[PDB]
Design a protein around this ligand. Sequence first.
Ligand SMILES: CCOc1ccc(-c2nnc([C@H]3C[C@H](NC(=O)c4ccnc5cccnc45)C3)n2-c2ccccc2)nc1
Ligand SMILES: [Zn+2]
Length: 209
Amino acid sequence: SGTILIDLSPDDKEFQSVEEEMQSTVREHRDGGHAGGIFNRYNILKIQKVCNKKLWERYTHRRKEVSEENHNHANERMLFHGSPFVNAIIHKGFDERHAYIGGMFGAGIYFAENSSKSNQYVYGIGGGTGCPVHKDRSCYICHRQLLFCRVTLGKSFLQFSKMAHSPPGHHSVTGRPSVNGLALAEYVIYRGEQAYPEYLITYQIMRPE
Ligand SMILES: CCOc1ccc(-c2nnc([C@H]3C[C@H](NC(=O)c4ccnc5cccnc45)C3)n2-c2ccccc2)nc1
Ligand SMILES: [Zn+2]
């Protein structure tokens, strides 16, 4: 595999930065919690740094290329990723060949700047049938995993809510909010090597009250 997970102590400022980013970027969703559950906060159980030399080199190699194509600017962002495939991704890396064709921006890998948006996909598109054990999308019991990832957007194409690759001259798509469309920003890459899954976050959504 080559992948090592480093457990971060809650007293570690690197843990605390990821924890804060996760808690602070929660929003109320217009679906009233249908996809990700009803919560305003998480129980952060565990944050692990993902260390894989092969995957890191794959990422930085792509990043150099994107940079030369975008006026020496990678347009690198730290973004949340949610999917059922977290375990595969930390071992084998992101893989566009596994992309689901039912996305707003076609067959790509979707990231978000709001943790609560990525949380809606941990059990599948629109939350699937919820947690495996209780078939509940708002399950407070079962533990979830998000990735907090290093993502190379390069020259990002701006769009509102049928697409295979980046537009010509572009490296990603930035989905922007619209009245008849997106509520929140999402980012899409069409090459797996434009993201590194840097931190694996184990959490529950917290029951409010
Ligand atoms: C309307 C919202 O649309 C979305 C939201 C998120 C995503 C998305 N963006 N990226 C993803 C996943 C990351 C991709 N998979 C891998 O990189 C992958 C990597 C390595 N092995 C695998 C084995 C099985 C499946 N996937 C893999 C698919 N997905 C995804 C999420 C939930 C279910 C299915 C796909 N796709 C569409
Ligand atoms: Zn459950």
